[PDB]
């Protein structure tokens, strides 16, 4: 019907270690694409401080407290019967001196 | 005003797509003047032809590669490379066909 595509691409975030960090994207396609997030080649699962809030086309990755073990490249993968779309963003986590 | 060398922001390491489907991969970048974008697979440039399956759309800070009706022979290691008057950058993503 119509493959996935990004109305709004996910942007890099630079955050102080221990503070909140979020990636946001807006995904279109028909039927509405299912979105999952990947890091290190593996699909991320929800946890105590990682969740994946979504409101319609708007899909997000939320770290309630971002630690250095969370830094790196996150991939947003959107999927429906017509295709798949991929976009990445760097989360940078800054440790105080 | 000052030049900025091109810098590719996040590009995925590996992506997968089912045969016969559309694949899209978007990638942000910076650099001043606006960098020229080249997509290539196995060292060979991808040509965005309006009468074909490969299409490339470039803005000031974004490139999108769309492959329609993905064939098993479309798989391989794709390189995004950027160039302006102040330097270059490249990143590779491994595109897998299921």
From Swiss-Prot, chain A:
Q: What is the effect of changing residue 9 to R?
A: Diminishes binding affinity for TTN
Q: Where in the cell is it found?
A: Cytoplasm; Cytoplasm, Cytoskeleton, Microtubule organizing center, Centrosome; Cytoplasm, Perinuclear region; Golgi apparatus
What cystine pairs are annotated? 25-76
Q: Describe the location of the Ig-like domain by residue ranges.
A: 4-92
Q: Which residues carry this modification: Phosphoserine?
A: 2
> Which parts of this chain are annotated as the region Interaction with TTN?
9-11, 77-86
**Which organs or tissues contain this protein?**
Widely expressed, with predominant levels found in the heart.
The disease this record links to the protein is: 3M syndrome 2: An autosomal recessive disorder characterized by severe pre- and postnatal growth retardation, facial dysmorphism, large head circumference, and normal intelligence and endocrine function. Skeletal changes include long slender tubular bones and tall vertebral bodies.
The task this protein performs is described as: Core component of the 3M complex, a complex required to regulate microtubule dynamics and genome integrity. It is unclear how the 3M complex regulates microtubules, it could act by controlling the level of a microtubule stabilizer. Acts as a regulator of the Cul7-RING(FBXW8) ubiquitin-protein ligase, playing a critical role in the ubiquitin ligase pathway that regulates Golgi morphogenesis and dendrite patterning in brain. Required to localize CUL7 to the Golgi apparatus in neurons.
Q: Assembly state and interactors?
A: Component of the 3M complex, composed of core components CUL7, CCDC8 and OBSL1. Interacts with CCDC8. Interacts with CUL7; the interaction is direct. Interacts with FBXW8. Interacts (via N-terminal Ig-like domain) with TTN/titin (via C-terminal Ig-like domain); the interaction is direct.
What is the name of this protein?
Answer: Obscurin-like protein 1
Q: What species is this protein from?
A: Homo sapiens (Human)
Q: What is the lineage of its organism?
A: Eukaryota, Metazoa, Chordata, Craniata, Vertebrata
Range covered out of full length = 9 to 105 of 1896
UniProtKB/Swiss-Prot annotation, chain B:
**What does UniProt say on post-translational modification here?**
Autophosphorylated.
Query: What tissues harbor this protein?
Result: Isoforms 3, 7 and 8 are expressed in cardiac muscle. Isoform 4 is expressed in vertebrate skeletal muscle. Isoform 6 is expressed in skeletal muscle (at protein level).
- Positions of the Ig-like domain: 6-94
Its annotated compartments are: Cytoplasm; Nucleus
Q: Self-association or partners: how does it assemble?
A: Interacts with MYOM1, MYOM2, tropomyosin and myosin. Interacts with actin, primarily via the PEVK domains and with MYPN. Interacts with FHL2, NEB, CRYAB, LMNA/lamin-A and LMNB/lamin-B. Interacts with TCAP/telethonin and/or ANK1 isoform Mu17/ank1.5, via the first two N-terminal immunoglobulin domains. Interacts with TRIM63 and TRIM55, through several domains including immunoglobulin domains 141 and 142. Interacts with ANKRD1, ANKRD2 and ANKRD23, via the region between immunoglobulin domains 77 and 78 and interacts with CAPN3, via immunoglobulin domain 79.
Q: Which disease is it linked to?
A: Myopathy, myofibrillar, 9, with early respiratory failure: An autosomal dominant myopathy characterized by adulthood onset of weakness in proximal, distal, axial and respiratory muscles. Pelvic girdle weakness, foot drop and neck weakness are the main symptoms at onset, but ultimately the weakness usually involves the proximal compartment of both upper and lower limbs. Additional features include variable degrees of Achilles tendon contractures, spinal rigidity and muscle hypertrophy. Respiratory involvement often leads to requirement for non-invasive ventilation support.
> Could you share any additional remarks the record makes about this protein?
In some isoforms, after the PEVK repeat region there is a long PEVK duplicated region. On account of this region, it has been very difficult to sequence the whole protein. The length of this region (ranging from 183 to 2174 residues), may be a key elastic element of titin.
What is the stated purpose of this protein?
Key component in the assembly and functioning of vertebrate striated muscles. By providing connections at the level of individual microfilaments, it contributes to the fine balance of forces between the two halves of the sarcomere. The size and extensibility of the cross-links are the main determinants of sarcomere extensibility properties of muscle. In non-muscle cells, seems to play a role in chromosome condensation and chromosome segregation during mitosis. Might link the lamina network to chromatin or nuclear actin, or both during interphase.
Family the entry assigns: Belongs to the protein kinase superfamily. CAMK Ser/Thr protein kinase family.
Description of its domains? ZIS1 and ZIS5 regions contain multiple SPXR consensus sites for ERK- and CDK-like protein kinases as well as multiple SP motifs. ZIS1 could adopt a closed conformation which would block the TCAP-binding site.
Descriptive protein name:
Titin
User: What is the protein's species of origin?
Assistant: Homo sapiens
Gene this chain is encoded by:
TTN
């Amino acid at each position: 019907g119509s493959p996935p595509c990004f109305l709004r691409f996910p942007r890099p975030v630079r955050v102080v270690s221990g503070a909140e960090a979020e990636l946001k994207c807006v995904v279109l396609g028909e039927p509405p694409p299912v979105v999952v997030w990947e890091k290190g080649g593996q699909q991320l699962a929800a946890s105590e401080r990682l969740s994946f809030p979504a409101d319609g086309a708007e899909h997000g990755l939320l770290l309630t407290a971002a630690l250095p073990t969370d830094a790196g490249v996150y991939v947003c993968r959107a999927r429906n019967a017509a295709g798949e779309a991929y976009a990445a963003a760097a989360v940078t986590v800054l440790e105080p001196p | 005003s000052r030049g900025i060398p091109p810098k590719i922001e996040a590009l995925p390491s590996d992506i997968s797509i089912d045969e016969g489907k559309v694949l899209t991969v978007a990638c942000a970048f910076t650099g001043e003047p606006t960098p020229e974008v080249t997509w290539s697979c196995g060292g060979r440039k991808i040509h965005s032809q309006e009468q074909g399956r490969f299409h490339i759309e470039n803005t000031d800070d974004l490139t999108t590669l769309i492959i329609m009706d993905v064939q098993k022979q479309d798989g391989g290691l794709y390189t995004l490379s950027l160039g302006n008057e102040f330097g270059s950058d490249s990143a590779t993503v491994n595109i897998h066909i299921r």
